[model samples]
Target: MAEVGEIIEGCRLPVLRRNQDNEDEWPLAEILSVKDISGRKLFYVHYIDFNKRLDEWVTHERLDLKKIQFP
Candidate 1:
């Protein structure tokens, strides 16, 4: 599993639910958290969805685990 603030390459990200309903949705964003969550395994994502960049930032959810792929 990847940690916060850790840069991940070749990551298979998906369009979030908020953006999924839109026809011209932006690709799910890839980002690293500057601050780590205590005892919580999560990383902040900086994505452009619906042409608006989230200010608070979004964290990875359990659903995101299903999006990951391995060669």
Candidate 2:
């Protein structure tokens, strides 16, 4: 699980691409913010070069921490 401050702003994170007919792919996303909603955590992510609808809240389980690159 990713903790607050660990996934900082401008960091690149891997987000699971869903609803694809082909093999699974992890796309790079920019971390906008991390918020706690009633004790549950959610990540505000923005996908570069993708539609705005793709940018939304994501759970920690949906994020690939190993593939994330911090700067």
Candidate 3:
């Protein structure tokens, strides 16, 4: 579970990043906000290289924490 300001990777398709491909792309997005619903986490993300219009709330299954960096 990422906190308020952790730097995490957003699944290309999960965040609706059409400009990005899933071949090997995992966009780094900052966790702007989070919410707990039914014991799962939903994150509001902001991509550094993506348009804000591409931003959206994401499900936990849609995020990758392995190479996840903390800010």
Candidate 4:
């Protein structure tokens, strides 16, 4: 599992279901924050592409480490 502020490189992220059919499928992103509240986990990540564009943050439900493909 990734910790808060951990720099995760070459991470594979899922594209929004509505946007998956576009040219950039599964737009990759970096894990920016991880939080645990009331036994629930949350992840904050940022999408980066050429020039590190799409400077935004997104939150995801708890993730199982084994399910993630590491680079």
Candidate 5:
């Protein structure tokens, strides 16, 4: 699990692109907050370049540590 304020690079998510096929793309994101609800951990991330204004909650399994760029 990523800690809050951690910079996570190469974060990939499925996005629907207009006039293009839906595919998985890497989006740079930073872990804003983390919470443990019951027994599951959820991470709130703010995506850069892809959608700067949106923040979404994602599970740890969704994050790819192999491509992550630590800062």
Candidate 6:
């Protein structure tokens, strides 16, 4: 099952980054935690090279379940 501590590739990052190149990039991130808000599951993720404060919640539409990596 999909759970925390796994590595997954997610797309369409936030705009606070404020860079045209970054907004269109998909980066590797580690699943820090998972939460069900208002009956919707949102994955809490930390980008591999990004800062802790940049960690954000993402929808299933941002994930590619077919290629999740466990380590």
Query: What are the lDDT scores of the predictions, listed in order?
Result: 0.44, 0.77, 0.58, 0.46, 0.55, 0.58
TM match of model 3 to true structure: 0.60
Give the winner by TM-score.
2
Strongest candidate by lDDT: 2
Order of the predicted models by TM-score, top scorer first: 2, 6, 3, 5, 4, 1
Query: For model 6, how does the per-residue alpha-carbon lDDT over 17-40 read when each residue is reduced to its tens digit?
Result: 223465645576676666666586
**lDDT by residue for model 5 (1-71), tens:** 54423533433333222222666655656666667774877777766565655667777665655455554
Q: What's model 1's overall lDDT? A: 0.44
**Each prediction's Cα RMSD?**
5.9, 2.7, 5.8, 6.0, 5.9, 6.1
Looking at model 2, the pairs that clash are none
Ranking by lDDT: 2, 3, 6, 5, 4, 1
**What value does the lDDT take at residue 52 in candidate 3?**
89
TM-score of each: 0.39, 0.73, 0.60, 0.40, 0.57, 0.62
Which of the predicted structures, 5 or 6, would earn the higher TM-score when compared with the native? 6
The CA lDDT at 41 in model 3 is 71
State the lDDT of candidate 3 residue by residue for 1-71, as single tens digits: 54323433432222323354545445667767677765867788887677788777777655675546554
| Tens digit per residue, CA lDDT, model 2, 1-71 | 55544877777878876745866667889988888765877888888788888787888777888777787
Which ranges in model 6 have alpha carbons more than 4 Å from their true place? Answer: 1-22
Model 4: lDDT equals: 0.46
Using lDDT as the yardstick, the better of models 4 and 6 is 6
Better of 1 and 4 by TM-score: 4
The TM-score, computed over Cα atoms with residue i paired to residue i, of candidate 6 is 0.62
